[PDB]
Structure formats: structure tokens, C-alpha cells
RNA sequence: AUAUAGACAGCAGGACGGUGGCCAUGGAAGUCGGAAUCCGCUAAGGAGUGUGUAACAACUCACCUGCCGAAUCAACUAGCCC
């Protein structure tokens, strides 16, 4: 069992992030463009899917 | 476009002094001395007065990419001032669902042993960067305190600790176990 | 509070429903009305209006009385089966009549375009009954 | 639209300040729209209240100050989430009613609580299916007559600390009186006079 | 203690919600460690105990016996605090000096057990032997030879069947 | 296009009453859907851009306000580079 504040701290690094639709890169939650060249710094981003 | 001049000034507190050796900044304060050279950036560093100790960073005829470096240098120098005056303290929390994470701090805080991460028999030995001391907090039950003068060294040590306890071949959205940087602050709170 | 209270609202009306209605689903909240309660509530709630009829009930530990708030669309659909200005002028007399008001004309301005489901020319240039209610 | 809005607002402010000679400047804390409606209804009978943009306020009372002197001394004092209540009544009659009609605001999550409260040892009165929040917070509760009972006095909150989500929902379900605040008078202005 | 309280509270609330109340014929059915409807230990190593046994042994250290232990258990469990320095019970979370007091349940049940746990896991022979003598734990041959987790199982079985 | 009648970005609040608006209903209460877009409080509030709750609820947005005190934003277009 994990209490909610520690769960939020873990989720800040593990779940609250953006994923590039082209190259699956793990980006910070406020990202607008991917940081990686192989997708061409695309702006096709989606939220990381939740366990809910 | 080439901008004629881009400058930025950092104020220096009275208890700390700064010496320039070309583009090498030596910041001596109550807690120690932080020395860092910026020879990879073509800027001009100057100390202004004998009264309030302003440090000016100047870039002449720079395009956008090298105008971006002036505030980078200024922020680095401010971090050096902050480190030698108040220091840097990173508080990390170890979170776990079933297996408690046992952390043992070896000699002088320079080595960290993680024992029971996710119940595995492997022992994680993480060596701190020089000048960074790790300790087990007496205020919280699962808390590591990393204290030092260099923000990059302290944060690199914290990142090493965080990345050592990485869940593999499992859903990381479910297996949230590990040591994570809870907060970043200073020592002495002044 | 007599160990149980009936503050909760309902959104049933028109057809009796009973078993088809969600009143048995509310039932386990208070355990008092049950079928012998929702049937006798619907007996008085058959009309006023013949629509969804969002209404509140008050429990006397054996029987329930029902009060229907003067919802604009509810009362206008009850009225319906043209201007008909007087019926909407008189339908707002017995309501709560708060509407964050500053004058009596605000309520009739509200209901004139609540009837839009064109009743907007009156809203544009209305010059009648500004102080009729007070 | 925006320009006409601002022009109409300027006209409203200048006519209101010309009409009403006595006004109290009053700070707005974390207050709700329901409280705004309640104050509007409870005050619109005898006086009026004004709460808009501070830049609008200063510009209106500065640029068109030529119509009456003894007004520029408000300018270095109108700061923060503040507004003006315009009344023809007197200071005590406004102050006592405005200090009495304070809505008991609950414990919203993410809100600082300078005041201190402490839960006593008393029966909750609710069903025994809400022990999860008590156990998560660390509260010893036991079954008694089909209701949850607080067997020991515990420290709930201190002064000047953040409120967690579990504490906020506990105070929401407890149906007790938490720390509360509302529209509080900063100072007064009666024809060119500054007091408390 | 918090986990035990979580489980006891869960049992009480579940039976209260999903069954009849105290006004029913069965009466007060919600469990209480102070009454003796709650047990601890592990059946894997064959050792179990209730508040009754430790209350009985503490009354023995300090009809009549049953009446003593009946209201002794009421202090054995609960949100009560015993100060080892004071030597007497207290109902206040703050001591007159200022030191935080351990609760009675932990301080005078779980603490000797944690002493013997730490001793027998860290292989402190002097601590294990002295705790055996302080708790008059009876042991036989083929059980007085081992040390570690099997000795922990044996000592738990013999001291607390 | 916005901006000293104080922009933009950050940090902090309000984001309502009728109305848990009508026809959809077994809950859809602002968001599984069909129509229309009212009024007032005003600092603003869509009888709703999204998350979601069985459903409530609890969040977020566009809308305004507070701190902040000088410029900022958007959509395109075409050179080299990817
Ligand atoms: Mg797998
Ligand atoms: Zn990418």
C-alpha cells in the first residue's frame, strides 16, 4: 500500500507524461513538440495512458 | 540578425566574494569554494564595483543561439553563490507497496546501499559525487537527504539514486516502487 | 432530524412507472417509502405537470407530500398541449422569484426566451409590465 | 465590445462615486460566487457594492478627479483584491452587519488556514462505512451503536499549513465548522477621511 | 498496531453495516481486543496469543484473578499510553516533562517480543538467554541448540503456544 | 490581434441562481445524444472546451479578477538544415 502523496510523487515521474505518437518518446507533461530528431520534432503528442 | 550587445548583471551578496580568472569564476563563501570555467562560451565577464559586487556578462554581436547563453551563465553563477552561502539539499522519498526499501549509508555518506528494492536479492551500490553527502533523515521514516555545495553534483547524485531503483519488465504505472526526489531546497534556510 | 430526512429530489413524472422508475433505487437511502411510498407519491404527482416534473417531497414518517418548484420549461410544457403573454406573466407570481434579480422585468425576460424551445422580438423591444408585479 | 464595456464601466464608476459620498474600501478574500450573490441580495436594499478591476478603479478615480478634490489620497492605498462599498448609512451600521453576515466557508483543498481548529471526541452520526479516511489519516475509530465514534482527541490542523485532500474531505463529511473567511473591510472613506 | 486497528475497524464496520445491530437478539457483536475476540500470532510457526494471556502474566507479575484480568485488558488495549520511565499508566498523549509516550499495547506487549525478535535475528546469545530467563521460557533438548529463525519458531512455540 | 484604460507567460481566486434548463431516461444533473443560446449578479461564467463519477460528486477549460510592471501573440509564407 502507498499513501496518496507518495503515490502522486511516484506518478509525477512514472505516469504524468506525454508520449510522441510517431516515436513513443516519453516527454514532460507540458511538451508541445517531441525532443527527438527521428520523428522530426513532431507535435503529434498524446497523454500517457492511465491505469484507470 | 546580430544583436550589438546583450548583457546581464548578477548581484553578489556581501558575505561571498567572486574572483575572475578569464572566464573561470571562483566563488568563495561561508560554506566553501565553487570554481567553474565557462571557456566554452565566448562572453566577457566583469566585476563592476568595490561596493556592491555586480558581475556583468556581456555578449557582443551574437546570434540567437549564443544570446541564449548569457542567462545560462548568470544562472550558473547564481547557483554557485547559492551553494556557497546556503548549500543545496535534496530530499528523496523511497516509496514501496510491499517490500520496504532498506537504505544503508556507508562511509561519510559517500556510498548508498539499497537492499530490498522490489524484494530482489541484488544490492545496489551507488557512489555519490565528491562533495555530496547522503544521510538518512531523522524526521521522516523513508527519506534520504543529499547535501552539498554544487547543485549539479547534488542533483546528479540524486538522479543516480533515482535511476538505480528502476522497475524493469513490469508496468511502471502500477509498480511505482523506487526512490524519488521529493523536494529541492537549501541548508540553513537563510 | 427525526432520525431520517427526505431532502433528496426526484426527476420522475408523467407515467406512473413505479417499478420501471428509479424510486426503488432511491429506496435503500431511507427505507421508509418503498413501493407503498412511491405509489402514493405518484398518486398526487400524476399532474402538475405531465412532464419529467422535477419535484421535492416531504416525509411524515408514514406518507409523503410533494411540492413542485415552478420550473419555467416545466410549467410552460404543462401549459402547452401566438403570444400568450398573460399566462407567463402570472406563472411567475408563485415562484421563488429570486433569479439574482434587480427588477421584476428580469424574470419575464428570462421566461420569454426560456419559451424559445420567435419569442425574441419582445425581448428586443419590450415596453410593457416593467413594474406590473410590484 | 471590449472598448464599449470599458467605457460603460468608466461611466458607471464616475456616476456612482458622484452619487454616493461615503464609501468603504473592502478586501475580498477567497470568496465564492454564491457568497457574492448572497451579499448582493443582502446589501442591495440599502447600499451598493462594487468589485471590479483595480486598474479600472485607479484610472477612474485619478483621471476624472477634477470634479471633486480630496480624492487622490486613496490612490496610494487601493491595492490587492479590493473594491468599494457605497453607502449613505454610517460606519457602525455597515460594519456590524458586514462582519455578521459571514458565510461559514468550508475547508477547500489547497487553501491555507491561518486559524486553528481541533476535532473533539464525539460521535460522527454517520454510517460505519467511512472508516477508510479515518484509518488513512491515522484515527482510531471503533463501532458503537452502528455509528463511528472518536475515542481520543487528536491534532487535526495547525496554523499556516496546507490542507491535504484527505483532511479536506474529512472536514467536508464531518459537517462541522472549519476555518472561514469572507469580505473584510480594509478602510473607510467619508468625504475625505481614512480610519479603520 | 495501526494495521491491527485497520483490520478490527474493517471487521466492525462490515458486520455493523451488513448485519443486525446491537439492538438485535445477538446484542453487541462488534469485536474488541479489550474483550478478547481478537487474536494475534502466526499459525505457520505455531504460536498465537491474545490480550488475555499477557494480561494474566502481568497480573501474576504484579474469581479474583479473572476479575483482575477482565478490567486489566481494558488498559492492555486501547488508545492508552504507558510510560516505561514513570512505571504507571496514563491517558494523556503528552507527558508532564514533554516526552512522547508509547502506547500501552506496543510498549508492554510488542516491545519484549521485538526485543526477542531482534536478539534472535541478530544472533545475540546473551540477549536471547536473558530474555528467556526474564520471561521464564521453558525449553527442552534439541530446541536449546539452535539459533536464528528455527530457534525463533521454537521459542515462540514454547513461550506462547 | 492584444497592451500603462497595464498586455503575454507564470503563481492565486471566482467559473453562479432559476436550472439536478426542454426532448431523449434505467443515471445521465453542462459534457452517450436532438434542437435551440434566456435573463440577472455583475468581475465573469458556455443553461458548457475536456477528465471523470454507475450516477452523485470532485477537477479542467473560455470568461473575469489579484500579484507581476514592458512589450507580446496568432495564422500563414519560403530559404538553408533535419
Ligand atoms: Mg509482463
Ligand atoms: Zn517523437
Q: Where are the beta strands (DSSP E) in D139-183?
A: 141-144, 147-150
Quoted resolution (Å): 2.8
Name the residue among D127, D129, D140 with its Cβ closest to that of E79: D140
Q: Could you tell me the three cell numbers for C44?
A: 398526487
Q: Is the CB of C11 under 7 A from strand F?
A: yes
Q: Which residues of E touch D127 (CB under 8 A)?
A: 17
Task: State the distance from the centre of ligand 1 to the C-alpha of B169, rounded, in angstroms.
Answer: 6
Q: Where are the beta strands (DSSP E) in chain D?
A: 22-27, 48-50, 82-87, 141-144, 147-150, 184-190
Identify the CA nearest to D101 among candidates D77, D112, D85, D117: D85
Name E42's bridge partners: E47
The Cα–Cα gap between B135 and C68 comes to 67
Identify the CA nearest to B163 among candidates A13, A17, A29, A28: A13
Per-residue DSSP letters for E102-127? PBHHIIIIIHHHHHHHHHHHTT-HHH
Q: How many residues does chain C have?
A: 134
CA dihedral E132, E136, E141, E146 (to 10 degrees): -20
E residues 30..89 contacting D (CB < 8 A): 30, 32, 78-79
Backbone angles phi, psi at C23, to 5 degrees: -55, -40
Residue with cell 506487549: E109
Name B10's bridge partners: B55
Q: Is the CB of C101 under 7 A from strand F?
A: yes
Q: Which residues of A touch B163 (CB under 8 A)?
A: none
Q: Is the CB of C3 under 7 A from strand F?
A: no
Identify the CA nearest to B23 among candidates B48, B52, B46, B54: B46
Backbone angles phi, psi at D106, to 5 degrees: -80, -170
Q: Is the CB of D51 under 7 A from strand F?
A: yes
Q: Which residues of D touch C29 (CB under 8 A)?
A: none
3-state secondary structure of D193: coil
Name D90's bridge partners: none
- From C1, which residue of chain D is nearest by alpha-carbon distance? D125
Q: Could you tell me the three cell numbers for B42?
A: 565566448
Q: Could you tell me the three cell numbers for D39?
A: 451579499
Alpha-carbon gap: E28 to the closest alpha carbon of chain D (Å): 9
Residue E12 and residue D140: Cβ atoms within 8 Å?
no
Per-residue DSSP letters for E41-93? EETTTTEEE-HHHHHHHHHHH--HHHHHHHHHHHHHSSS-EE-TTT-SEES-S
The Cα–Cα gap between C96 and C69 comes to 8
Q: Integer distance in angstroms from CA A46 to C1' F50?
A: 14
Q: How many CB atoms lie within 10 A of CB B82?
A: 20
Q: Which residues of A touch B96 (CB under 8 A)?
A: 2
Residue A3 and residue D165: Cβ atoms within 8 Å?
no
D138 φ/ψ sector (left φ>0, alpha ψ -120 to 50, else beta): left
Q: Could you tell me the three cell numbers for C30?
A: 431511507
Prior bond to C49 cis, omega within 30? yes
Please enumerate in sequence order all residues whose Cβ is within 8 A of that of B1, keeping only pairs 6 or more positions apart, or say none.
B63, B64
How many angstroms separate the first and last alpha carbons of chain B?
A: 43
Contact B30, B57 (CB under 8 A): no
Name the residue among D129, D140, D144 with its Cβ closest to that of E17: D129
Task: State the distance from the centre of ligand 1 to the C-alpha of B96, rounded, in angstroms.
Answer: 19
Contact B92, B161 (CB under 8 A): yes
3-state secondary structure of B12: coil
3-state secondary structure of D162: coil
Q: Find the helix or strand (DSSP H, E) in which E13 lies.
A: helix E2-18
Contact B9, B46 (CB under 8 A): no
Q: Which residues of D touch E21 (CB under 8 A)?
A: 145-146
Contact D162, D75 (CB under 8 A): no
Chain D residues with at least one Cβ partner in E under 8 Å: 127-129, 131, 134-135, 138, 140-146, 148, 151-152
The Cα–Cα gap between C99 and C109 comes to 11
Q: Find the helix or strand (DSSP H, E) in which E12 lies.
A: helix E2-18
Q: Integer distance in angstroms from CA C6 to C1' F54?
A: 22
Please enumerate in sequence order all residues whose Cβ is within 8 A of that of C51, keeping only pairs 6 or more positions apart, or say none.
C13, C14, C74, C77, C78
Residue D136 and residue A5: Cβ atoms within 8 Å?
no
CA dihedral E47, E52, E57, E58 (to 10 degrees): 130
The Cα–Cα gap between B153 and B89 comes to 11
The Cα–Cα gap between C43 and C38 comes to 8
**What's the sign of the alpha-carbon dihedral E11, E12, E13, E19?**
positive
Q: Is the CB of C52 under 7 A from strand F?
A: yes
Interface probe with D: pick from A1, A4, A7, A8, most Cβ of D within 10 Å: A4
Name B6's bridge partners: B59
Residue D135 and residue E22: Cβ atoms within 8 Å?
no
Residue with cell 443582502: D42
Q: Is the CB of C67 under 7 A from strand F?
A: no
Order of strands across the sheet with B124-127?
B103-105, B111-114, B124-127
The Cα–Cα gap between B68 and B62 comes to 9
Residue with cell 473533539: D120
Q: Find the helix or strand (DSSP H, E) in which C64 lies.
A: strand C64-67
- From B183, which residue of chain A is nearest by alpha-carbon distance? A9
Annotated binding site of E for GTP: 42-44
Q: Could you tell me the three cell numbers for B83?
A: 551553494
Residue A51 and residue B172: Cβ atoms within 8 Å?
no
Ion ligand 2 neighbours (CB, 5 A) are A 20, 22-23, 25, 34, 36, 39
Q: Could you tell me the three cell numbers for E151?
A: 530457534
Q: Which residue lies nearest F47, CA-to-C1' measured?
A: C114
Q: How many CB atoms lie within 10 A of CB D193?
A: 11
Q: Which chains touch E (3 or more CB pairs under 8 A)?
A: D
**What's the sign of the alpha-carbon dihedral E82, E86, E89, E90?**
negative
Backbone angles phi, psi at E40, to 5 degrees: -130, 175
Task: Please list the alpha-helical segments (H only) found in D20-156.
Answer: 33-43, 54-63, 91-100, 131-137
Identify the CA nearest to C74 among candidates C101, C105, C103, C95: C95
Helix E111-121 vs helix E149-159: angle between axes, to the nearest 10 degrees? 150
Q: Integer distance in angstroms from CA D55 to C1' F4?
A: 10
Name C9's bridge partners: C56
Identify the CA nearest to B143 among candidates B110, B187, B94: B94
Name the closest ligand to CA B174.
1
Q: Where are the beta strands (DSSP E) in chain B?
A: 3-11, 17-21, 24-29, 32-37, 44-47, 54-62, 88-95, 103-105, 111-114, 124-127, 133-136, 143-148, 178-185
Indicate which technique resolved this structure.
cryo-EM
Residue A3 and residue D164: Cβ atoms within 8 Å?
no
Q: Which chains touch B (3 or more CB pairs under 8 A)?
A: A
- Strand F: which bases are under 7 Å from protein Cβ? 2-7, 12-28, 34-45, 47, 52-54, 58-59, 64-69, 82
3-state secondary structure of D112: coil
Q: How many residues does chain D have?
A: 196
Rg (C-alpha) for chain C, rounded Å, is 18
Name E12's bridge partners: none
Q: Which residues of A touch D135 (CB under 8 A)?
A: none
The Cα–Cα gap between D121 and D150 comes to 5
**What's the sign of the alpha-carbon dihedral C106, C112, C114, C116?**
negative
Helix E64-76 vs helix E51-61: angle between axes, to the nearest 10 degrees? 120
Contact D14, D82 (CB under 8 A): no
Name the residue among E5, E9, E17 with its Cβ closest to that of D127: E17
Contact C94, C66 (CB under 8 A): no
Q: Find the helix or strand (DSSP H, E) in which B158 lies.
A: helix B151-164
Annotated binding site of E: 42-44
Q: Find the helix or strand (DSSP H, E) in which C58 lies.
A: strand C55-59
| D71 burial type by CB count under 10 A (0-12 exposed, 13-18 middle, 19+ buried) | middle
Helix C105-114 vs helix C72-79: angle between axes, to the nearest 10 degrees? 60
Task: Please list the alpha-helical segments (H only) found in C15-120.
Answer: 23-26, 34-44, 72-79, 85-91, 105-114
The Cα–Cα gap between D117 and D170 comes to 13
Q: Per residue in B105-133, is it b (16+ CB within 10 Å) or e — as a string? A: beeebbebebebbbeeeeebebebbebbe
Q: Integer distance in angstroms from CA C118 to C1' F39?
A: 16
Q: Which residues of E touch D141 (CB under 8 A)?
A: 9
Q: Is the CB of D52 under 7 A from strand F?
A: yes
Rg (C-alpha) for chain E, rounded Å, is 18
Q: How many CB atoms lie within 10 A of CB E107?
A: 16
Interface probe with C: pick from D39, D41, D146, most Cβ of C within 10 Å: D41
Identify the CA nearest to C45 among candidates C10, C88, C86, C83: C10
Backbone angles phi, psi at D17, to 5 degrees: -75, -30
Name the closest ligand to CA B175.
1
Task: State the distance from the centre of ligand 2 to the C-alpha of E41, rounded, in angstroms.
Answer: 55
Q: Find the helix or strand (DSSP H, E) in which D6 lies.
A: helix D2-19
Q: Per residue in D116-134, is it b (16+ CB within 10 Å) or e — as a string? A: ebebeeeebeeebebbebb
Name B90's bridge partners: B146, B184
Alpha-carbon gap: B169 to the closest alpha carbon of chain A (Å): 14
Alpha-carbon gap: B173 to the closest alpha carbon of chain A (Å): 6
Identify the CA nearest to B125 among candidates B152, B106, B143: B106
Identify the CA nearest to D196 among candidates D25, D19, D15, D7: D25
Backbone angles phi, psi at D25, to 5 degrees: -85, 130
Q: Could you tell me the three cell numbers for C113?
A: 426566451
Amino acid at each position: 500500500i502507498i499513501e496518496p502523496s507518495l503515490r502522486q510523487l511516484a506518478q509525477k515521474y512514472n505516469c504524468d507524461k506525454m508520449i510522441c505518437r510517431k516515436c513513443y518518446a516519453r516527454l514532460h507533461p507540458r511538451a508541445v513538440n517531441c525532443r527527438k530528431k527521428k520523428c522530426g520534432h513532431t507535435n503529434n503528442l498524446r497523454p500517457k495512458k492511465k491505469v484507470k | 540578425m546580430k544583436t550589438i550587445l546583450s548583457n546581464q548583471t548578477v548581484d553578489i551578496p556581501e558575505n561571498v566574494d567572486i574572483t575572475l580568472k578569464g572566464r573561470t569564476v571562483i566563488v568563495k563563501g561561508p560554506r566553501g569554494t565553487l570554481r567553474r570555467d565557462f571557456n566554452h562560451i565566448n562572453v566577457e565577464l566583469s566585476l563592476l564595483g568595490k561596493k556592491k559586487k555586480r558581475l556583468r556578462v556581456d555578449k557582443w554581436w551574437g546570434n540567437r543561439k549564443e544570446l541564449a547563453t548569457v542567462r545560462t551563465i548568470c544562472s550558473h553563477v547564481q547557483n554557485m553563490i547559492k551553494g556557497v552561502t546556503l548549500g543545496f539539499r535534496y530530499k528523496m522519498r523511497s516509496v514501496y507497496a510491499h517490500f520496504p526499501i532498506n537504505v544503508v549509508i556507508q562511509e561519510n555518506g559517500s556510498l548508498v546501499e539499497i537492499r530490498n528494492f522490489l524484494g530482489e536479492k541484488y544490492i545496489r551500490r551507488v557512489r555519490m559525487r565528491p562533495g555530496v553527502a547522503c544521510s538518512v533523515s531523522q524526521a521522516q521514516k523513508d527519506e534520504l537527504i543529499l547535501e552539498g555545495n554544487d547543485i549539479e553534483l547534488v542533483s546528479n547524485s540524486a538522479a543516480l539514486i533515482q535511476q538505480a531503483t528502476t522497475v524493469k519488465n513490469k508496468d511502471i504505472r502500477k509498480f511505482l516502487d523506487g526512490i524519488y526526489v521529493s523536494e529541492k531546497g537549501t541548508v540553513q534556510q537563510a | 432530524p427525526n432520525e431520517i430526512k427526505v431532502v433528496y429530489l426526484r426527476c420522475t413524472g408523467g407515467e406512473v412507472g413505479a417499478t420501471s422508475a428509479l424510486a426503488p433505487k432511491i429506496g435503500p437511502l431511507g427505507l421508509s417509502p418503498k413501493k407503498v411510498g412511491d405509489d402514493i407519491a405518484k398518486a398526487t404527482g400524476d399532474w402538475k405537470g405531465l412532464r419529467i416534473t422535477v419535484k421535492l417531497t416531504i416525509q411524515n414518517r408514514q406518507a409523503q407530500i410533494e411540492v413542485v418548484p415552478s420550473a419555467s420549461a416545466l410549467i410552460i410544457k404543462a401549459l402547452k398541449e401566438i403570444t400568450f403573454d398573460e399566462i407567463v406573466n402570472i406563472a411567475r407570481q408563485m415562484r421563488h422569484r429570486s433569479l439574482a434579480r434587480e427588477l421584476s422585468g428580469t424574470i419575464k425576460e428570462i421566461l420569454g426566451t426560456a419559451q424559445s424551445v420567435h419569442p425574441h422580438d419582445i425581448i428586443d423591444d419590450i415596453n410593457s409590465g416593467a413594474v406590473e408585479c410590484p | 465590445d471590449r472598448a464599449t464595456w470599458k467605457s460603460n464601466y468608466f461611466l458607471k464608476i464616475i456616476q456612482l462615486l458622484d452619487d454616493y459620498p461615503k464609501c468603504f474600501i473592502v478586501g475580498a478574500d477567497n470568496v465564492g460566487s454564491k457568497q457574492m450573490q448572497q451579499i448582493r441580495m443582502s446589501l442591495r436594499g440599502k447600499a451598493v457594492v462594487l468589485m471590479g478591476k483595480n486598474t479600472m478603479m485607479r484610472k477612474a478615480i485619478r483621471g476624472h478627479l477634477e470634479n471633486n478634490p480630496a480624492l487622490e489620497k486613496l490612490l496610494p492605498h487601493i491595492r490587492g483584491n479590493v473594491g468599494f462599498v457605497f453607502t449613505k448609512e454610517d460606519l457602525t451600521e455597515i460594519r456590524d452587519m458586514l462582519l455578521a453576515n459571514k458565510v461559514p466557508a468550508a475547508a477547500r483543498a489547497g487553501a491555507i488556514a491561518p486559524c486553528e481548529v481541533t476535532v473533539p471526541a464525539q460521535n460522527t452520526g454517520l454510517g460505519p462505512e467511512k472508516t477508510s479516511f479515518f484509518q488513512a489519516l491515522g484515527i482510531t475509530t471503533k463501532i458503537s451503536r452502528g455509528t463511528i465514534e472518536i475515542l481520543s482527541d487528536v491534532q487535526l490542523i495547525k496554523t499556516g499549513d496546507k490542507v491535504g485532500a484527505s483532511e479536506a474531505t474529512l472536514l467536508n463529511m464531518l459537517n462541522i465548522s472549519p476555518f472561514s473567511f469572507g469580505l473584510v473591510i480594509q478602510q473607510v472613506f467619508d468625504n475625505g477621511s481614512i480610519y479603520n | 498496531y495501526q494495521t491491527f486497528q485497520r483490520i478490527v475497524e474493517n471487521v466492525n464496520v462490515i458486520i455493523s453495516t451488513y448485519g443486525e445491530g446491537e439492538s438485535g437478539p445477538m446484542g453487541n457483536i462488534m469485536i474488541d481486543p479489550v474483550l478478547g475476540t481478537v487474536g494475534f500470532g502466526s499459525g505457520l510457526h505455531g504460536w498465537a496469543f491474545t490480550l488475555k494471556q499477557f494480561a494474566e502474566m502481568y497480573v501474576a507479575k504484579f474469581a479474583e484473578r479473572a476479575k483482575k484480568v477482565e478490567d486489566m485488558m481494558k488498559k492492555l488495549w486501547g488508545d492508552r499510553y504507558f510510560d516505561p520511565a514513570n512505571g504507571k499508566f496514563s491517558k494523556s498523549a503528552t507527558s508532564p516533562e514533554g516526552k512522547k509516550l508509547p502506547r500501552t499495547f506496543c510498549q508492554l506487549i510488542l516491545d519484549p517480543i521485538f526485543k526477542v525478535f531482534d536478539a534472535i535475528m541478530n544472533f545475540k546469545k546473551e540477549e536471547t538467554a536473558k530474555l528467556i530467563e526474564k520471561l521464564d521460557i521453558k525449553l527442552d533438548s534439541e530446541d536449546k541448540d539452535k539459533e536464528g529463525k528455527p530457534l525463533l519458531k521454537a521459542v515462540m512455540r514454547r513461550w506462547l503456544p
